[PDB]
Design a binder for this molecule. Structure first.
Ligand SMILES: CCCCCCCCCCCCCCCCCC(=O)OCC(COC(=O)CCCCCCCCCCCCCCCCC)OC(=O)CCCCCCCCCCCCCCCCC
Ligand code: HEA
Ligand code: HEA
Ligand SMILES: CCCCC/C=C/C/C=C/C/C=C/C/C=C\CCCC(=O)O[C@H](COC(=O)CCCCCCCCCCCCCCCCC)COP(=O)(O)OCCN
Ligand SMILES: CCCCC/C=C\C/C=C/C/C=C\C/C=C\CCCC(=O)O[C@H](COC(=O)CCCCCCCCCCCCCCCCC)COP(=O)(O)OCCN
Ligand SMILES: CCCCC/C=C/C/C=C/CCCCCCCC(=O)O[C@H](COC(=O)CCCCCCCCCCCCCCC)COP(=O)(O)OCC[N+](C)(C)C
Ligand SMILES: CCCCCC/C=C/CCCCCCCCCC(=O)O[C@H](COC(=O)CCCCCCCCCCCCCCC)COP(=O)(O)OC[C@@H](O)CO
Ligand SMILES: CCCCCC/C=C\CCCCCCCCCC(=O)O[C@H](COC(=O)CCCCCCCCCCCCCCC)COP(=O)(O)OC[C@@H](O)CO
Ligand SMILES: CCCCCC/C=C\CCCCCCCCCC(=O)O[C@H](COC(=O)CCCCCCCCCCCCCCC)COP(=O)(O)OC[C@@H](O)CO
Ligand SMILES: CCCCCCCCCCO[C@@H]1O[C@H](CO)[C@@H](O[C@H]2O[C@H](CO)[C@@H](O)[C@H](O)[C@H]2O)[C@H](O)[C@H]1O
Ligand SMILES: C[C@H](CCC(=O)O)[C@H]1CC[C@H]2[C@@H]3[C@H](O)C[C@@H]4C[C@H](O)CC[C@]4(C)[C@H]3C[C@H](O)[C@]12C
Ligand SMILES: C[C@H](CCC(=O)O)[C@H]1CC[C@H]2[C@@H]3[C@H](O)C[C@@H]4C[C@H](O)CC[C@]4(C)[C@H]3C[C@H](O)[C@]12C
Ligand SMILES: C[C@H](CCC(=O)O)[C@H]1CC[C@H]2[C@@H]3[C@H](O)C[C@@H]4C[C@H](O)CC[C@]4(C)[C@H]3C[C@H](O)[C@]12C
Ligand code: CUA
Ligand SMILES: [Cu+2]
Ligand SMILES: [Mg+2]
Ligand code: NA
Ligand SMILES: [Zn+2]
Lengths: 43, 514, 79, 46, 98, 84, 259, 227, 58
């Protein structure tokens, strides 16, 4: 497949941010619930 | 315009796009559930501390993955996008009914997610067998909400099936015969026939489960002369066809992918592939009681159902060898999609072979309701269906979007996911032979090592799902527009550019009758 | 005549894994004999074989329930 | 007539990559979060 | 035991249904309902492929019974040839409707 | 079979009209006449409080929750016997 | 301008309203069955009939008035309808299975007999025989109606269609009568379960069929159908023959054999 | 019981289970034959630059690859079905015991002579005497005569359960209103463990089964001590 | 009755840029706005009801 170059190229810095924001969006909320599991059962 | 376009669609491409979004999301819901399962089992003892909650998580996991991720992505998404493009049709036969097939899923899904929120959830398993599913052991609205969710999804898929069949039969070019349609179109046509005949029997069954819970019928309650075994028969009469429904669009997608990236103009043994899918379809109807090999049915019956289940391997084998024959002498291009497709071929074969083991009712006594069964279907379903979905998604993404994915990232993604799913499910074969039951929140101490490894595996695959989310973002963020596509002479889906216009084939194709 | 009873023997009337009917047949067969022989003044111990077999095979809670229903007058089988 | 072509056949804007990142985040994120909050909710009733 | 009162299509058919029906009588097929018959597909006797615009997708079933159609765009101008079998098609565009 | 009739050469509306009034409806009449003679409130059945009948695992979502939807007190007992 | 004979449908809100109406009825029924309220069910039913009215209105508009139903489109709808009928044949099959399952293997708790001890069956030579004659007759009459239409005979089409609708109603009253007069109920174990749920769903289908034939009636009053294009009537006829056939199977299976 | 790091089946205790072990080894040999074949043939296809992208005549070969799997399947079916019909078979039992499933415990009934019945429940982890197995020990075990053909009868008084003992090759669903028969024949004394193999609610993981096989003399005395 | 099918053909084929579900009059618009209102009202109500049932009640 052939393609033009990126119209709005995403640099390594921009990628690193993207990937970090992505991972933290999955990890932080699940972690919050899980880290506090005991405060829910002990109740 | 937003409403008119997206809530009020009569366009197969946008409807397809709605399905893919809904599917991707429910996939996230399902994925979370799956990790909760493996958190609980990742070291010995308890984590949740409520075990009904665990059976709720297990039950929701399967319903989400089957009805709300796999079916909508493969039939609703790929099916609506691709089928009209491959037979040169302007849209589906019934474009407005088609929108309702879609808008039934969110409410179908709302009812299921509601069922976990009210009372103590529906912790029955995805089989929902009474009496555990009945009005004493599961008093309250959770099971009834689960039942209605399934009604809405089955109506969605029944109406969808009528649309696909009518379209594929009636809306080809006049000259084109059915044996001139691509294999993916065939795979959807046969999957729709299966849905049409199976989903109503389920509806009958779970309606009789609903009347038992709320109108004092006793279809399945021995107090009234009922029999809980009747529910099992009706459920699995649908349930076995359902598993073949879940893989058949994958078989097609794979045939397209292996062919494309071999640089072939067609797959090997086209008519053999049509034959194999029809035979699988047919035999898929006469094997259901292999799910009931421990309920105490007659030995002659158990003998028929073992023998009949085994034949299915013949036409399945034809496909496997036909795909390898397609690779024979290919100018093989190592795209991500080709890697997903090769993954499928091997991991499905393994999954299928453990299927043959279980077909033996002698052995099934010892393997039934163990982790051997869980390992079987996670190979054949979750490294079959999912691998096919991933290969399809990367192959055809530039057609849908107009942008390209980053091939290197896509390959890192395959490699991470490949390790994780094998690390998760492979050891479970051992858990099963050694006697660990399914649907257990905690195990005897012996089973610790494999359960620990299995659970670490689940985490690796989580990293793949997260990375895929990034991958999509990067493609949309960068905007590398497609220019040129290979092998268009034999791949009509591509022939209208990327993305193809709102209305395509306003003027039909030209095809001669000779 | 004829005993040394160990347990219920095989019965080709009920050759298969489901033995629900085998408990039940022998439960009627007994109470049917034991009504017939109590009305004629004869020997109830001709009925004994059937009692041994139903006690072997039937759950206590089934028999217990079935017995309460002959008492109560709500027993669905023809005796 | 509706807008055609790359970035225009979808029900969400891709004009700004960072607005897009925020939405993807919310979309997939809410989906992955939900079972963790349903479990928590059921643990806080009994 | 006899009487009328029920319209015929000729009287009461409308829209595109009517268009289709009137064109069928005149022996024409503007809305591509029928499979077009092929010529000999040599340069002198090309397949005439009509079109409301300057291009149309041709699908060539090269040999009867082949399971794979060969798809390509035919443009206005000099006859093109199937990439697979070299039969000739020419865009004889236009007008169509009456 | 072929019933006993004879015709299949023209299938007019006339023929299907001839059947509607000549055979179809007269059957409805005879079968109505039959029913309007055997009908006459049956000897109502004696109440034995059997346990496989009058099932109540959960009360109905209308009424006092113990009456079925087309409850007819002349023939449908509750689980405690007939009403007045 | 298109040059194929298919109908591209205008964007429509009825699929959404239909889907939302399905949410309201299913969640309203839950509300009814458990938390003892009919509000949502009432509302759901209302938006459901409202949706169905407008959606089918717009098809009549699209076909009778705008003329989008080319023969290509008609072929479409034929398959669509047969395919739907098949899905219903499989639905009812669930209930016949459950009947034959239970009736051929009566359990100890019933007496080990069919019918169960305590059950007083209806006589198949009384009203059930009449019910059967009524639907079979309705089959003859709708056939006359179809031949009337094809021979452009307006008055007779309408008469045959009226006789049909009436017979369908007669059936419905006779069945309601027998339901009321029945000495067993839905709660009288598996005999009552299989009886009222199968005959029930069939009953509902007779109403849906009659409602459909009535629509066809008013459409014929208003001159919508031609002697060649009248697919609403064909679908209704097939739907009625399906209903007549399911009755025969119920009559033989449940009424005669399982008495 | 399972031991740590186990890969295959529990060691066989009855003759039936011994027969299955061997039939598994037969089947798995064929499974390894075919997975190896598909793997070798994949890598073969992908390790060459030589090409042949034109049409291939596709029937001559399809006869090999339908007939051959058919024969392999008969090779698995024959021994599978022998074993199946053997597991049924006219038994001639010396004794008949009934187990009844409940949420969440098994009760057992020996009623050929006397009305002996007991409940059987999981020892809590907190009440385990050292050396005892977590989640597997009952308080009252199922005592049975060894080397004697026993008729087991399975049912439930509530929901579905499933009575299973891997070591002996047994799994029989426990269905209310239904009496399900299996036959049990131990070749050796000992303790032998299984677990509820059907989802019966929240305590499904914690309602296990212990058989204690001893000789008849000792069995007789135990029965009498339990009335 | 009489045959006014041809007047209706003309009214519904008028080239006034309206979708078929609104093409009949103000009635179509009224009936539409009412349907859509009851659907969205009841949906909000049903979500609320769910919220009510997701926790227990002493
Ligand atoms: C992950 C943990 C693995 C643990 C193994 C530790 C063993 C130590 C015991 C130290 C040795 C102790 C020796 C005592 C033997 C007693 C065991 C017994 O009674 O007998 C029972 C045994 C008999 O079988 C075995 O004898 C073990 C089989 C091991 C297969 C090798 C695969 C290894 C790859 C796993 C890595 C994960 C990622 C790749 C996954 C690959 C997918 C197959 O267990 C089974 O029945 C397993 C059933 C699985 C059926 C699936 C078929 C799939 C075919 C794959 C072939 C691909 C070719 C390799 C090509 C491989 C390269 C791709
Ligand atoms: C995509 C989903 C999918 C697919 C395709 C399959 C495919 C097969 N399955 Fe599986 N199965 C499931 C999903 C699927 N299954 C699920 C979800 C359950 C569990 C339900 C539950 O309890 O939750 C299940 C359970 C299940 C059971 C019941 C086990 C138990 O509950 O105790 C059995 C028994 O026979 C079985 C058999 C088979 C067989 C014979 C095939 C065959 O179609 C596979 C055939 C393929 C091959 C054999 C490989 C290719 C062929 C060759 C290389 C030719 C040569 C081969 C030979 C000579 C052997 N499956
Ligand atoms: C297709 C169906 C499907 C899928 C995908 C999965 C995926 C997974 N499943 Fe599950 N599972 C079932 C169907 C499925 N499962 C069924 C039917 C049962 C039986 C339930 C019961 O007992 O009643 C079950 C049971 C089950 C158990 C046993 C529970 C028990 O017996 O107690 C376990 C334990 O580990 C498990 C684990 C997993 C894991 C780790 C994953 C995943 O982590 C594997 C990796 C895959 C992904 C993470 C998906 C990623 C893909 C997407 C999100 C789609 C992306 C889409 C686009 C981009 C368009 N599953
Ligand atoms: C509480 C329960 C009540 C029942 C409820 C259910 C009701 C449903 C049915 C209703 C009947 C309605 C019928 C319509 C009424 C009138 C139609 C009049 C219009 C007409 O025109 O019909 C006339 C015939 O009517 C005719 O015999 C009509 C003849 C009707 C026949 C009925 C049966 C008569 C009874 C005697 C028969 C029994 C013995 C026969 C045994 C032989 C077995 C084969 C035809 O005459 P023409 O010269 O050919 O006309 C040509 C002009 N177009
Ligand atoms: C001429 C008769 C025509 C029918 C008109 C009556 C009611 C409408 C019902 C429509 C839905 C059809 C079947 C629902 C199931 C059972 C009802 C069966 C019909 C019936 O009406 O049976 C009655 C009881 O109904 C009862 O409980 C009352 C039950 C009423 C509430 C409806 C139950 C809701 C369940 C619906 C499930 C929906 C599943 C659809 C799935 C769609 C496909 C996915 C019988 O009366 P009885 O007093 O028991 O005995 C007679 C004593 N003399
Ligand atoms: C569980 C059991 C599983 C069983 C697995 C079975 C494996 C069987 C393998 C068999 C391979 C050995 C066959 C050797 C016989 C010789 C036939 C041949 O392959 O010769 C070819 C025949 O062609 C043609 O049909 C087209 C040539 C290709 C025909 C074969 C294609 C499939 C080959 C298999 C691909 C790998 C998959 C194997 C399956 C596991 C020669 O090429 P052509 O004439 O096209 O070109 C030359 C043109 N000339 C004549 C005009 C100048
Ligand atoms: C007291 C009242 C209670 C009622 C409760 C439930 C309500 C049920 C409603 C009954 C069904 C009525 C259906 C009416 C359909 C009208 C639309 C129509 O008939 O549209 C026709 C097309 O058919 C088409 O789409 C085909 C459309 C057919 C649809 C099939 C309808 C049956 C499905 C009903 C659902 C059953 C579900 C069962 C649930 C368990 C229009 O084309 P023609 O006729 O060719 O005309 C064109 C000519 O004018 C030109 O020459
Ligand atoms: C307790 C409640 C449980 C849940 C049930 C409720 C589910 C949904 C809510 C009901 C909403 C109904 C609204 C009307 C839908 C009518 C569909 C229809 O009429 O579909 C037609 C096509 O299919 C055809 O004929 C053939 C299709 C006929 C089917 C008609 C729709 C029936 C829907 C019920 C399905 C029941 C399934 C039965 C088996 C279990 C029309 O096609 P369109 O694409 O519109 O137009 C195309 C144009 O060319 C026409 O000019
Ligand atoms: C159509 C013909 C194809 C050819 C294949 C034949 C398949 C089915 C037809 C055979 C049905 C009658 C069989 C008669 C023999 C007696 C049945 C019987 O009695 O079997 C019982 C139930 O069967 C039952 O109702 C069975 C009820 C029927 C369920 C069958 C499922 C298939 C449904 C799909 C149909 C497709 C749609 C077609 C529409 C026309 C189960 O076993 P029991 O006897 O309780 O065990 C006794 C012991 O436990 C006690 O000691
Ligand atoms: C199943 C998939 C998910 C598994 C993998 C998750 C990876 C973990 C991500 C961590 O997320 C955060 O971890 C902190 C723990 O380090 C938590 O802070 C908690 O702990 C800190 C102290 O340890 C305090 O400062 C915080 O206030 C307190 O909320 C915080 O809530 C949680 O979001
Ligand atoms: C309607 C049909 C044919 C009329 C025709 O098309 O010429 C005629 C022929 C014979 C008629 C029948 C016969 O005259 C005998 C019956 C006479 C009664 O007056 C009505 C019922 C009765 C059963 C008639 C009904 C109907 O008028 C029939 C059936
Ligand atoms: C004749 C038919 C259609 C071919 C065509 O019309 O072009 C072909 C297609 C696939 C063929 C089948 C498949 O190739 C699989 C089988 C292969 C065996 O060698 C013969 C039987 C076998 C079951 C074949 C019989 C027959 O030749 C089939 C069914
Ligand atoms: C007078 C009117 C004419 C209608 C027309 O030609 O447009 C006629 C023709 C057919 C008649 C209908 C049919 O004959 C069927 C019914 C017959 C009953 O005798 C009266 C009601 C009945 C429902 C009739 C009403 C009305 O008299 C109709 C509708
Ligand atoms: Cu008892 Cu699981
Ligand atoms: Cu199956
Ligand atoms: Mg099981
Ligand atoms: Na745990
Ligand atoms: Zn060509």
């Amino acid at each position: 497949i052939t393609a033009k170059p990126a119209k709005t190229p995403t640099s390594p810095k921009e990628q690193a941010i993207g990937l970090s924001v992505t991972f933290l969006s999955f990890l932080l909320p699940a972690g919050w619930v899980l880290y506090h599991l005991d405060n829910y059962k002990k109740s | 315009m937003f409403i008119n376009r997206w809530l009020f669609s009569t366009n197969h491409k946008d409807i397809g796009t709605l399905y893919l979004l809904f599917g991707a999301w429910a996939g996230m819901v399902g994925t979370a559930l799956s990790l909760l399962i493996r958190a609980e089992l990742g070291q010995p003892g308890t984590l949740l501390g409520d075990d009904q909650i665990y059976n709720v998580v297990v039950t929701a996991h399967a319903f989400v993955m089957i009805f709300f991720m796999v079916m909508p992505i493969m039939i609703g998404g790929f099916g609506n996008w691709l089928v009209p493009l491959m037979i040169g049709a302007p849209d589906m036969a019934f474009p407005r009914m088609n929108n309702m097939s879609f808008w039934l899923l969110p409410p179908s899904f709302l009812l299921l997610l509601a069922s976990s929120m009210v009372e103590a959830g529906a912790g029955t398993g995805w089989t929902v067998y009474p009496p555990l599913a009945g009005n004493l052991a599961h008093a309250g609205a959770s099971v009834d909400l689960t039942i209605f969710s399934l009604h809405l999804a089955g109506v969605s898929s029944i109406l969808g099936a009528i649309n696909f069949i009518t379209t594929i039969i009636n809306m080809k070019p006049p000259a084109m015969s059915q044996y001139q349609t691509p294999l993916f179109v065939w795979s959807v046509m046969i999957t729709a026939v299966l849905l049409l005949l199976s989903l109503p029997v389920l509806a009958a069954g779970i309606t009789m489960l609903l009347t038992d819970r709320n109108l004092n019928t006793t279809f399945f309650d021995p107090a009234g002369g009922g029999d809980p075994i009747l529910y099992q028969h009706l459920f699995w009469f649908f349930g076995h066809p359902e598993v073949y429904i879940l893989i058949l669009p994958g078989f097609g997608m794979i045939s397209h992918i292996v062919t494309y990236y071999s640089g072939k103009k067609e797959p090997f043994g086209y008519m053999g592939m049509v034959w194999a899918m029809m035979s699988i379809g047919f035999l898929g109807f006469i094997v259901w009681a292999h799910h009931m090999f421990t309920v105490g049915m007659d030995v002659d019956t158990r003998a028929y159902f073992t023998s009949a289940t085994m034949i299915i391997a013949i036409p399945t084998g034809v496909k496997v060898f036909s795909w390898l024959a397609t690779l024979h002498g290919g100018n093989i291009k190592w795209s991500p999609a080709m890697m997903w497709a090769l993954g499928f071929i091997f991991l499905f074969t393994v999954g299928g072979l453990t299927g043959i083991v279980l077909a033996n009712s002698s052995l099934d006594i010892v393997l039934h309701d163990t982790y051997y069964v869980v390992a079987h279907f996670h190979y054949v379903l979750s490294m079959g269906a999912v691998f096919a979905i991933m290969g399809g998604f990367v192959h055809w993404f530039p057609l849908f979007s107009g942008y390209t994915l980053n091939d290197t990232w896509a390959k890192i993604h395959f490699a991470i996911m490949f390790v994780g799913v094998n690390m998760t499910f492979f050891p479970q074969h051992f858990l099963g032979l050694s006697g660990m039951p399914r649907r257990y929140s905690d195990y005897p101490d012996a089973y610790t090592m494999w359960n620990t490894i299995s659970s670490m595996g689940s985490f690796i695959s989580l990293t793949a799902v997260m990375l895929m989310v990034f991958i999509i973002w990067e493609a949309f963020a960068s905007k590398r527009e497609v220019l040129t596509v290979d092998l268009t002479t034999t791949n009509l889906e591509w022939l209208n550019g990327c993305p193809p216009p709102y209305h395509t084939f306003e003027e039909p194709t030209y095809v001669n009758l000779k | 005549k004829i005993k040394n009873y160990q347990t219920a023997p095989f019965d080709s009337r009920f050759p298969n894994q489901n033995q629900t009917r085998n408990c039940w047949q022998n439960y009627l067969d007994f109470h049917r004999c034991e009504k017939a022989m109590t009305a004629k003044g004869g020997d109830v111990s001709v009925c004994e074989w059937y009692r041994r077999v139903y006690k072997s095979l039937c759950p206590i809670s089934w028999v217990s329930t079935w017995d309460d229903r002959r008492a109560e007058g709500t027993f669905p089988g023809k005796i | 007539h509706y807008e055609e072509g790359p970035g225009k056949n979808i029900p969400f804007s891709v004009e700004n990559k960072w607005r897009l990142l925020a939405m993807m985040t919310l979309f997939f994120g809410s989906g992955f979060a939900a079972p963790f909050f349903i479990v928590r909710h059921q643990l806080l009733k009994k | 035991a006899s009487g009328g009162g029920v319209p015929t299509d000729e009287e009461q058919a409308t829209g595109l249904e009517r268009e289709v029906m009137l064109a069928a009588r005149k022996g024409q097929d503007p809305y591509n309902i029928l499979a077009p018959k092929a010529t000999s597909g040599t340069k002198e006797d090309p397949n005439l492929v009509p079109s409301i615009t300057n291009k149309r997708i041709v699908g060539c079933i090269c040999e009867e019974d082949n399971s794979t159609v060969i798809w390509f765009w035919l443009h206005k101008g000099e006859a093109q040839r199937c990439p697979s079998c070299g039969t000739h098609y020419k865009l004889v565009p236009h007008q169509l409707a009456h | 079979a072929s019933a006993a009739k004879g015709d299949h050469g023209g299938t007019g509306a006339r023929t299907w009209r001839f059947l509607t009034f000549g055979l179809a409806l007269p059957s409805v009449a005879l079968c109505t006449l039959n029913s309007w003679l055997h009908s006459g409130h049956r000897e109502r059945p004696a109440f034995i409080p059997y346990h496989h009948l009058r099932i109540r695992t959960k009360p109905f979502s209308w009424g006092d929750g113990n009456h079925t939807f087309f409850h007819n007190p002349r023939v449908n007992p509750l689980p405690t016997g007939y009403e007045k | 301008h298109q040059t194929h004979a298919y109908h591209m449908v205008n964007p429509s809100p009825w699929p959404l309203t239909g889907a939302l109406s399905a949410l309201l009825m299913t969640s309203g029924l839950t509300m009814w069955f458990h938390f003892n309220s009919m509000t949502l069910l009432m509302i759901g039913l209302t938006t459901n009939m409202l949706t169905m009215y407008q959606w089918w209105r717009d098809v009549i508009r699209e076909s009778t008035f705008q003329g989008h139903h080319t023969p290509a489109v008609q072929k479409g709808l034929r398959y669509g309808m047969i395919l739907f009928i098949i899905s219903e044949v499989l639905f009812f099959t669930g209930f016949f299975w459950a009947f034959y399952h239970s009736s051929l293997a009566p359990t100890p708790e019933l007496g080990g007999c069919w019918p169960p001890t305590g059950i007083h069956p209806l006589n198949p030579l009384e009203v059930p025989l009449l019910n059967t004659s009524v639907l079979l007759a309705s089959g003859v009459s709708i056939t006359w109606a179809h031949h009337s239409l094809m021979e452009g005979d307006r008055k007779h089409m309408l008469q045959a269609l009226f006789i049909t609708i009436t017979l369908g109603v007669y059936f419905t009253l006779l069945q309601a009568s027998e339901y009321y007069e029945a000495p067993f109920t839905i709660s009288d174990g598996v005999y009552g379960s299989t009886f009222f749920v199968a005959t029930g769903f069939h009953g509902l289908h007779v109403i849906i069929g009659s409602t459909f034939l009535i629509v066809c009636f008013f459409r014929q009053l208003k001159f919508h159908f031609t002697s060649n294009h009248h697919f609403g009537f064909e679908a209704a006829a097939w739907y009625w023959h399906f209903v007549d056939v399911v009755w025969l199977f119920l009559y033989v299976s449940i009424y005669w054999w399982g008495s | 019981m399972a031991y740590p790091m186990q890969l295959g089946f529990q060691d066989a205790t009855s003759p039936i289970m011994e027969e299955l072990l061997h039939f598994h080894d037969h089947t798995l040999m064929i499974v390894f034959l075919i997975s190896s074949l598909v793997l070798y043939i994949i890598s073969l296809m992908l390790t060459t630059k030589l090409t042949h992208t034109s049409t291939m005549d596709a029937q001559e070969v399809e006869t090999i690859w339908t007939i051959l799997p058919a024969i392999i399947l008969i090779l698995i079916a024959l021994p599978s079905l022998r074993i199946l019909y053997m597991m049924d078979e006219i038994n001639n039992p010396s004794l008949t015991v009934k187990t009844m499933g409940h949420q969440w415990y098994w009760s057992y009934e020996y009623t050929d002579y006397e009305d002996l019945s007991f409940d059987s429940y999981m020892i809590p982890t907190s009440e385990l005497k050292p050396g005892e197995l977590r989640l597997l020990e009952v308080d009252n075990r199922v005592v049975l005569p060894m080397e004697m053909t026993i008729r087991m009868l399975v049912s439930s008084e509530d929901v579905l359960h499933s009575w299973a003992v891997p070591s002996l090759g047994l799994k029989t669903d426990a269905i209310p209103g239904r009496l399900n028969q299996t036959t049990l024949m131990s070749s050796r004394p000992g303790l032998y463990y299984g677990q509820c193999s059907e989802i019966c609610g929240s305590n499904h993981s914690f309602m296990p089964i212990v058989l204690e096989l001893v000789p008849l003399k000792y069995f007789e005395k135990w029965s009498a001590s339990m009335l | 009755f009489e045959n006014r099918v041809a007047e209706k053909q003309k009214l519904f084929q008028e080239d006034n840029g309206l979708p078929v579900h609104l093409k009949g009059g103000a009635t179509d618009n009224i009936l539409y706005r009412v349907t859509m209102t009851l659907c969205l009202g009841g949906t909000l109500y049903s979500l609320y009801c769910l919220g009510w049932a997701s926790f227990p009640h002493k």
